[PDB]
Structure formats: structure tokens, C-alpha cells
Amino acid sequence: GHMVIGTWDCDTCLVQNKPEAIKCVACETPKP
Ligand SMILES: [Zn+2]
Fold first, then answer.
1. Is 10 annotated as a binding residue?
2. CATH of the domain at 13
3. Which residues form a coiled coil?
4. Checking DSSP bridges between strand 16-17 and strand 8-9, what pairing results, if any?
5. CA of 21 to the centre of ligand 1 (A)
6. Cα 16 to ligand 1 centre (Å)
7. Neighbouring residues of 7: CB distance < 8 A, sequence distance ≥ 6
8. How many whole angstroms from 18 Cα to the centroid of ligand 1?
9. What's the gap in Å between 2 CA and the centre of ligand 1?
10. Binding site annotation covers 24?
11. Exposed/middle/buried for 29, CB within 10 Å: 0-12, 13-18, 19+?
12. Where are the beta strands (DSSP E) in 1-32?
């Protein structure tokens, strides 16, 4: 919640996620 921006938005389920993750947090999609 602090200087952690960079979240990526999905393109299949339409859901944002943290850049520290490996996949989506809604559809479980493989991060690019
Ligand atoms: Zn997704």
C-alpha cells in the first residue's frame, strides 16, 4: 500500500494484480 504501484491489469477476466505476483488473483492467468 506504499510505493508498490505497478499493478498489471488482466485482458481476459479484467482484473488488476500486484507486480509481485506471478498470475492473476481472479482467473489465475499466467503473468506476461
Ligand atoms: Zn485475470
1. yes
2. 4.10.1060.10
3. none
4. antiparallel
5. 12
6. 7
7. 16, 17, 18, 19
8. 12
9. 23
10. yes
11. middle
12. 8-9, 16-17
Residue type, 24: C
Please list, residue by residue across 2-28, b when 16 or more beta carbons sit within 10 angstroms of its beta carbon and e when fewer do: eeeeeeeebeeeeeebeeeeeebeeee
List the determination method: NMR
Instruction: Tell me the sheet residues that pair with 23.
Output: 30
Residues 6+ apart with CB under 8 A from 3: none
Q: Is 13 annotated as a binding residue?
A: yes
Q: 10: domain range?
A: 1-32
